[PDB]
């Protein structure tokens, strides 16, 4: 489709930032929510559930954790929180607060301890969800942030937008339709505006071992402003959670006991 083709062309012409702004602008012509509701999707033995927040990339969703759920079999059951609006018909959230509310609702209405997990921008959604859960009285035992680049610490990702955008078209596992592409615009604006709050929750940073592009020093790595443990897995920003899902599972096991 036209949006998908424009996204591709945005990547090769160095104009992703302004195309993301166009997608955000379009997304303001879909309907939004701020009594809407959603449901987790079950993906096994274990005492503490690993709950996964879908990413916010155009190809994102529950399916992107299939390989880590499999690698976590025998360690923890795995449930997945979808990001509302990536499926046709779903409204978009008016804010980070609006999506954490309905997501927090669905976790509390179906749990029994748990940790919350997310990849890339998914990590930021996961930490917002855990923030909202700790505020409501049902706090997870911790958060696992997989290649998180919080706002203000994304110089590497911005300098690699062409590499990442072409890599997303290689690994297009669900096809980026219009509903997905505008949702990408709308969530990208929300997470850009959002700022994590200190919570005191135990935090595990799972960083990639390999950069997605050239860089002069180590400062390309994920970062987190509050106290946390850090572990590295083989792979780049994309492969760390797919072809190397087992390396992450083992670190999650160790961190859980």
């Amino acid at each position: 489709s036209a949006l998908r083709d424009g996204y591709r062309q945005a990547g090769v012409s160095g104009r992703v930032r302004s195309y993301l702004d166009l997608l955000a602008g379009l997304s303001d012509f879909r309907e939004h929510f701020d009594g809407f509701s959603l449901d987790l999707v079950d993906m096994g033995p274990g005492e503490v559930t690993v709950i996964c927040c879908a990413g916010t990339a155009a190809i994102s969703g529950p399916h992107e954790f299939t390989r880590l759920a499999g690698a976590l079999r025998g360690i923890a059951p795995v449930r997945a929180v979808p990001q509302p609006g990536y499926e046709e018909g779903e409204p978009l959230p008016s804010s980070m607060a609006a999506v954490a509310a309905v997501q927090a609702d669905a976790v509390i209405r179906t749990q029994k301890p748990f940790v919350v997990a997310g990849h890339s921008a998914g990590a930021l959604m996961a930490y917002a969800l855990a923030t909202e859960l700790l505020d409501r009285g049902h706090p997870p035992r911790g958060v696992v942030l997989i290649d998180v680049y919080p706002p203000g610490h994304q110089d590497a990702m911005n300098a690699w937008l062409e590499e990442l955008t072409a890599t997303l078209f290689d690994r297009e596992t669900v096809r980026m339709d219009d509903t997905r592409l505008t949702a990408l615009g709308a969530y990208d604006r929300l997470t850009g505006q959002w700022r994590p709050r200190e919570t005191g929750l135990p935090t595990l940073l799972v960083s990639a071992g390999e950069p997605m592009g050239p860089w002069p020093d180590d400062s390309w790595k994920p970062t987190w402003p509050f106290e946390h443990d850090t572990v590295a897995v083989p792979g780049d920003h994309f492969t760390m959670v797919q072809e190397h899902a087992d390396a992450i599972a083992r670190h999650i096991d160790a961190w859980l006991g």
């Epitope: 104009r15 930032r17 110089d155 300098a159 690699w160 592009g213 050239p214 002069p216």
Partner: antibody
Framework: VQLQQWGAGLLKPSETLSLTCAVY????????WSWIRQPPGKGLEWIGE???????NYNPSLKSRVTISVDTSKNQFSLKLSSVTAADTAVYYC??????????????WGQGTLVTVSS | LDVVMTQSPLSLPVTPGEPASISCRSS???????????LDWYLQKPGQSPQLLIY???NRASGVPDRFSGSGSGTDFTLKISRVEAEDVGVYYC?????????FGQGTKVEIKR
């Protein structure tokens, strides 16, 4: 979309070179911004670069004397080079994102200010 | 230690409408884990600032006519013009972007044999 360059063209040895580049047409926040120099008759030497947050990459041969600054408020970035000698005589250019991806629509380099060092 | 870029030939006279090729060889590989090569080509026409022609080894900047094209990977790279025209007189530089500092080849001057 366009870069304008100004600054003093003659300075005595041991003094401090000072140049400024202004970026017209936005897109300031997505790229590192470079300074390059070209002594008369010779090739190109990369000096260093800065982004909007003020993060800085320098050429080790010049790191001791070079300072690159940014003023996001005016979309301007500046070059200062201290304790200057005759080997710093050159044409100095400003540019966007040298060597990074994303450069299909790269702006033209600044037109370059010649800087001569002499008493 | 800095990449050293060697350009060949340093001087290249071509009769117009003939093709021409410039080679450059780096002292370390410009190939990156992710597959891309970070090699740029610039043209400095007489009296002007360098301008980008080829970026990421093989991609043409906007406004660059299709007679220009680049090729190569890892340690050697070439720039080729198919039908050399009068407008193409100037000095061609390659520059590597995989390492810091960025470093340039010596430059090769193209003269039109008229």
């Amino acid at each position: 979309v366009q870069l304008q360059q100004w600054g003093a063209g003659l300075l005595k040895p041991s003094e401090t070179l000072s140049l400024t580049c202004a970026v017209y047409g936005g897109s300031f926040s997505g790229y590192y911004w470079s300074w390059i120099r070209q002594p008369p008759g010779k090739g190109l030497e990369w000096i260093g670069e800065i982004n909007h947050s003020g993060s800085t990459n320098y050429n080790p041969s010049l790191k001791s004397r070079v300072t690159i600054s940014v003023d996001t408020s005016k979309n301007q970035f500046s070059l200062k080079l201290s304790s200057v000698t005759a080997a710093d005589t050159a044409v100095y250019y400003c540019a966007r994102g040298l060597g990074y991806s994303g450069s299909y629509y790269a702006p033209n380099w600044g037109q370059g200010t010649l800087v001569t060092v002499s008493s | 230690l800095d990449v050293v870029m060697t350009q060949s030939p340093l001087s290249l006279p071509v009769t117009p409408g003939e093709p021409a090729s410039i080679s450059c060889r780096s002292s370390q590989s410009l190939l990156h884990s992710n597959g891309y090569n970070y090699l740029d080509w610039y043209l400095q026409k007489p009296g002007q600032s360098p301008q980008l022609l080829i970026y990421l080894g093989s991609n043409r900047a906007s406004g660059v006519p299709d007679r220009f094209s680049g090729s190569g990977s890892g340690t050697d790279f070439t720039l080729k013009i198919s039908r050399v025209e009068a407008e193409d007189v100037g000095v061609y530089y390659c520059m590597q972007g995989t390492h810091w500092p960025r470093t340039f080849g010596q430059g090769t001057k193209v003269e039109i044999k008229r």
